[PDB]
């Protein structure tokens, strides 16, 4: 949004509140005291406001709400009502919009009565207001006309004389009942209601011309509506509506959702004699909502259609046959583009969820809510997809046509999603996908007939001027092959020189860390998966292979990080390898003082060990054993200290022999954001560490003990053999990694599977640019153990596939974080997270994890 | 109109492919 | 200005909020835009080779072209190899061209780094391609051409690797260096040949076709185009006092340059031309491209002074009583006044006590008219006011004249307007206030009644609106109550504790670096006596354990709190010069509890924070550490071994004293004020009468005979300076002197003879006096009451609250029960030891045990 | 109009405190 900051992630330290605030006249007696930043809490002075009774929450529209507010005030300051309303107009449209809850929706004014001055306050609200309507919370009955609901909700803390305070426990009885804020209005148990309100609970009413739907599923319930199917009465089609309740669902216009719906019902209309034309079965407003149903067509997405119909592999493609269903889709939404361009229709929302395709290749367009019906202006594109968000307050069609720009870029090379970021990034994409679709082997006539069509559609984008602070970045044109060892360090001159760049961006706005961090790992800083020294120990590593440093800033920051890096165990209780204690202890041990770090080592050790509730190499006790089997091969402890760490490690593959699951728990197969329950492929959040583990012991002492729970520990990464996640962290390039770090220890039956899964990490595309849940991790890999001078060609492999996903800055290059946009830093997905396959790549080291 | 149910239908979750 | 000001309490530097339109150019490729200090935007090409010390072009624009003209210079220099900057949001082209800002940086929005070699293909290209031009006249340069184009021969990027000697902005010519000459006139500097092209250029001359016929005579420091300054005619010799109005600079936030305030103060003297006062225009002429405007002085003294020589401060002083009739005649002739000019549509917009002028009988005369509006139909917000006088709810211009003559009534009535910017109607405390002083006084009733009757007459023309500033919590008290009984300050103090929930919760709901507010000079100090987070909590203490009501709101965890934040401030303040120890923090550690390590504390940081002293005083130099030193040593805290060092330094500074008195005892005659200027010597902690309080306590400790002569001789040092010039104006206080010494005699007072304790009660009449400005125990009014009746040796406890809390009434804004006090410069909320609460918490908790707290009674 | 000294006149200090 406006509000969010450009380049980097950002939590919450940037509520500007740049906007027009609410506040109510204070007389005398009373008070108004500031909450957590959204609401003003006003209450009488010596007034006995007493706890568990009946809230009013008043609810109103954006127009009249100034008006509405005074009218409240002024009708409660009289009387000795406690009062509250929110604090700006930011944090209304918050609270009345399409991504916040709808347990909490229309929350502006909660006043606070008593029980014997009750039905005087609302007959009295009730005829003070008598009008402006308003939303409708999902917690009431509305009472009367006016926007009146009675919830018998949450008061002040219990005082030190009662008892049982339980904050959103309602004290019922002796008994507390959980305040579930579901959408119906639930009366909870026990609480006889009053004698004058006992007459409202039964105000029910008849019956008439009831609609003829039969509502089967709910997929999408955002604030107002839902992506969800339904069935028609007496057409036997399949039929998906929409919801619209009043005076709900903002942007930062004052634009509801009802003439969002009334615009797309008007477009519809309108677009109903072409092929797919989703057409208005019924349209109708019934009690207060409106709602609207159209037709669906059979049919995928295209983000489903990309991932299915794509040369990842070798063999999925066959007699190739791709570039030309290319050209036919793209040359079918140019033609139906241009078809609605004449009786003054536009769509101003291009996604890949929008664009629907069905057998024969046959395209449909959906989801017409932001339509606009008139070109003359230069409005700005308000809303937009991740990767399709147009710039400058360019002209409504040519933001349709940059959406169809950006859509034949992704078809052409899936990577849109960092187009927001970077102004012009398609360029990357349009000289990328050449140097391998010469490499697939595609014919001459369709590439050079998708890069004409590639320069036609790049013609009516409005090439502009760049005004969005974001004139730092922009794509690269210079991408050349590889052929020589000086390729390679000016190139990585350049991607050290483009670290210090984005560090004094990120530290002349923000404070609080010194590195930008991914969302996932924002508030992490330790260990070497989401901190601010395992970045700058990379980049160490990284520059003490180059000749020169050429760094401006390096020394300061060496001696801060120390200073900052120690306090974080009296503070912090994350354990483990990643992110966890002994993770820092690790990268100040390859920093510099190595006393300091004996000294951490020795000292903060057996806590470490007993805290860990997982056994996970992520987060837990496996990743303490490793940091401690490689302090023993170095010798930096004594026999004292390292004898109980064996025994220690034995008691954790004893049990793990003879019950192999333990803590496997359900077979989960997804990562997504990677917190619930992972695929538990691989290093990190894997299975597999432990047999990480078992080679490292093997590799140092020697039994048949840990062989055999090493060759088990394989075997059952080995029951995933079958996908569609060869990656490095979770996925199957792990697997791959042990067999080659331990080539010589495992037998030929399982060496025999490396030449099998080699084929299906093989793949051409990644999505994202890291190592752990990127493309690098899987060609850092591919040569990690080689055992032979292929240096160069791994090189000339894995930078000509990271040509695609940089953006250059002065005289350097950067990568582009998680999920595409909002760069950043880290091991996930950042300079570091190319930078260790960097260092690793022509090493055969793979600092990550030792080798004894 | 005059009828509550829009609110008594809102919410019943299911299926997820 | 007062918007970006955050209210209540004070704020830091790191308060830019920034919510205004950026300035930005696009940028090519082989180009980048990196950000300086938030406030330029410094764009260079990639490749080129910049130098350093070369011929910087500045570039001077508008406020309405200012887009027009970025965009161009940006757009010519894109297209050539000139690194270029300019200014980051509109902001801060504001602040550098408005009223506040320095001379010597006026105006300067692109400085444009061309290379050394080509400047005459730079300098036509700047000319011919910026077609319109409108800019300034920047104080560096002499205006090449016509278009607003400066070659200022300043500093480029800083020194590479290969040049050593870096010397930002100090390198002209070679191995030596001279500073870079920030006068306004233009100056070429020692050395540096120019180019051939510009020797052409600098020579130019003109003739003369006149010569201003006005002779400025003297001056004094500017703002930025004109100044205070006096000068004299041609024609005739009577004085003149003429502004100047420098084109297109003094801005205010709204797009209003100065030229037209000038032209609305000259066409509303043209129509006042008969009233007396407010004089007409004796010449107004725009010579080459400023305006000057011709306004006669007449002979007169600002309100200010007027209030400061013409006030019963004294019995003594305005005898036979009156002033009543001066007041009302002064203030009936400013209604009479206001009512005549209310009638040709003119107005005021600015009443201050600068801005009223009385002379010999009591002439009322009015100046600075360059915020009048011809207009009355619209509500405008009051743009700029003084501290004292700024309205609220955009009132009409034909009543915010009357809001300022309401509040200069006020201070007619009672001098203490300075806050009613942040507490609204605040003239309810004064006006009940100045009733009852002016009851004890002994001025008549009906004098009293005409006065109050007039000052309700102002008080009816108020517009009583909404208050709505977020400053609705804050209000003035109508419960102004005697004091009968304990019960009446057990009440006070219970309310006084109790609002602090409330106005410390508030300072953590928008800050989080400190955790208490502080005043202005005291916001980055946070450690020791004079402004501290733990001092406050610690008053607190023993301001709670003085009364039985407990106000359990929050004490554990802030209590704990407070020694995690502060053990890592005792290494010095991790940037001590001399306050590296301010010892006395283990005293209040020793107060909070576990002296455990206090006492460890006070044993390892005692003799690195002594010989790092210099400048030597209670407060800057060494000799407030000894004060707290001899008390461990008397409380049994410390060993003899570390005891004897610390005795051998009380014998060693005694001898330093008495052998040459002149050594660091310089006062400079004349009253020092406070704060920085004027080198603060007039007594305690800031001067020399601290090492009088050393003598007394170390002579209570332990006989010594040099101890009773070096107490003499700092007696004698301020005794000296025994001008009290029938009474007073002057500096009396607790901190300069008077009350501070009244406070050293009665202390040690069996110890010295009668000859010092004969001037006691000639000194008493002296310092009792009924008014003070400043609420604070330093600089302020209670710091004269705790000293008092601190050491009578009678139980008058009783009077003295009964006189203190009844005087303190004036200073109190209520935060809906509780009472809080505005500090120094009182426009802003604050607490601390100097001016706030403590002030009056420390004044408080001695008055009623006669302890004394800030130093030890041993 | 033209003159160039009411710049080269402005940086006077000179004395006026009463």
């Known amino acids: 949004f406006n509000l969010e900051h450009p380049f980097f992630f950002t939590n919450n330290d940037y509520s500007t509140d740049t906007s027009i605030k609410y506040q109510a006249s204070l007389p005398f007696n009373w008070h108004e005291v500031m909450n957590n930043d959204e609401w003003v809490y006003q209450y009488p002075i010596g007034k006995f406001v007493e706890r568990q009774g009946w809230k009013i929450h008043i609810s109103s529209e954006y127009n009249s709400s100034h008006e509405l507010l005074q009218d409240v005030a002024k009708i409660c300051h009289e009387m000795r009502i406690p009062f509250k309303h929110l604090s700006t107009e930011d944090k209304f449209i918050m609270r009345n919009g399409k991504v916040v809850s709808r347990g ?75 305040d ?30 009831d609609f003829p739907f039969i509502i089967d599923n709910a997929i999408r319930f955002s604030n107002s509506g839902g992506i969800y199917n339904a069935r028609l009465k007496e057409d036997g089609k399949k039929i998906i509506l929409k919801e619209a309740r009043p005076y709900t669902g903002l942007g930062f216009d004052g634009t509801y959702s009802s003439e969002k719906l009334a615009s797309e019902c008007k477009a519809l209309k309108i677009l109903n004699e072409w092929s797919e034309a989703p057409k208005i079965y019924w349209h109708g407003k019934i009690w207060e909502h409106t709602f609207l149903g159209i037709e669906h067509m059979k049919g995928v997405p295209l983000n489903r259609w990309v991932t299915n119909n794509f040369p990842l592999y070798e063999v999925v493609d066959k007699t190739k046959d791709y570039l030309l269903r290319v050209s036919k889709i793209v040359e ?37 809510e932001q339509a606009v019906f008139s070109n003359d202006e230069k409005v700005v594109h308000k809303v937009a997809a991740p990767g399709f968000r147009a710039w400058r307050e360019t002209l409504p069609s040519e933001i349709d046509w940059y ?7 992704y078809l052409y090379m899936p990577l849109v999603t960092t187009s927001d970021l970077t102004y012009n990034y398609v360029s990357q994409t349009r000289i990328e996908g050449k140097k391998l679709f010469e490499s697939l082997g595609y014919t001459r006539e369709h590439i050079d007939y998708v890069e004409s069509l590639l320069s036609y559609l790049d013609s009516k984008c409005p090439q502009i001027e760049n005004i969005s602070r974001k004139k730092v970045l922009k794509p690269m044109h210079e991408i050349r092959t590889i052929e020589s060892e000086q390729d390679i360090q000016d190139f990585i001159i350049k991607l050290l020189r483009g670290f210090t760049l984005t560090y004094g961006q990120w530290r002349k706005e923000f404070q609080s860390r010194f590195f930008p961090v991914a969302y996932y790992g924002l508030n992490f800083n330790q260990g070497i998966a989401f901190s601010d020294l395992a970045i700058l120990w990379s980049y160490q590593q990284l520059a003490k292979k180059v000749k020169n440093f050429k760094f401006d800033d390096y020394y300061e920051i060496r001696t801060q990080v120390i200073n900052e890096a120690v306090n974080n165990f009296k503070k912090s209780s994350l354990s483990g390898l990643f992110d966890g204690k002994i993770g820092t202890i690790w990268l100040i041990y390859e920093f510099g003082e190595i006393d300091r770090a004996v000294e951490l080592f020795t000292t903060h050790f057996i806590e470490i060990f007993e805290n860990s509730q997982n056994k996970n190499l992520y987060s837990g006790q496996a990743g303490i054993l490793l940091v401690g089997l490689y302090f023993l091969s170095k010798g930096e402890i004594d026999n004292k200290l390292g004898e109980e760490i064996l025994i220690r490690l034995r008691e954790y593959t004893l049990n793990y022999i003879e019950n192999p699951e333990t803590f496997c728990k359900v077979g989960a197969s997804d990562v997504q954001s990677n917190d619930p329950y992972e695929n538990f492929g691989g290093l990190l959040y894997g299975h597999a560490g432990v047999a990480w583990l078992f080679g490292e012991a093997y590799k140092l002492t020697g039994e048949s003990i840990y062989k055999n729970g090493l060759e088990l520990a394989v075997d059952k990464e080995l029951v995933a053999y079958k996908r569609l996640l060869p990656y490095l962290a979770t996925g199957s390039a792990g697997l791959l ?32 640019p890291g190592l752990f849940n990127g493309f690098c991790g899987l060609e850092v890999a591919n040569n990690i153990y080689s055992d032979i001078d292929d240096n160069f060609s791994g090189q000339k492999k894995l930078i000509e596939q990271l040509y695609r996903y940089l953006c250059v800055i002065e005289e350097g290059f950067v990568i582009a974080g998680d999920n595409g946009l909002k760069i950043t830093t880290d091991i996930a997905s950042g300079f570091a997270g190319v930078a260790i396959g960097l260092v690793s790549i022509m090493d055969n080291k793979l600092t990550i994890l030792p080798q004894i | 109109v005059s009828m509550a149910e829009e609110v008594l239908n809102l919410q019943l979750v299911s299926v997820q492919v």
């Open chain 1, 104 to 178: 909490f929706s229309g929350k502006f004014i909660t006043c606070y009565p008593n029980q014997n001055e009750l039905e005087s306050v609302l007959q009295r609200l009730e005829s003070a207001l008598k009008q402006y309507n308003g939303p409708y919370i999902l917690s009431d009955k509305r009472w009367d006309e006016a926007p009146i609901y009675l919830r018998y909700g949450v008061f002040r803390p219990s005082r030190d004389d009662e008892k049982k305070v339980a904050i959103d426990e309602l004290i019922v009885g002796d008994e507390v009942v959980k």
């Open chain 1, 180 to 209: 579930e804020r579901l959408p119906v209005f639930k009366i909870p148990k026990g609480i006889v209601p009053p004698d004058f309100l006992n007459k409202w609970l039964d105000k029910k009413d008849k019956k008439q011309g």
């Open chain 1, 332 to 368: 079918k939404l140019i033609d139906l583009t241009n078809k609605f361009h004449s009786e003054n229709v536009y769509h101003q929302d291009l996604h890949l969820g929008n664009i629907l395709v069905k057998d024969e290749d046959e395209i449909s367009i959906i989801d017409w």
């Open chain 1, 403 to 409: 959406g169809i720009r950006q859509i034949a870029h």
């Open chain 1, 737 to 768: 990694l042990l067999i080659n770090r331990n080539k010589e220890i495992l037998s030929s039956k399982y060496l025999k599977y490396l030449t099998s899964l080699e084929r299906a990490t093989d793949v051409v595309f990644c999505v994202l």
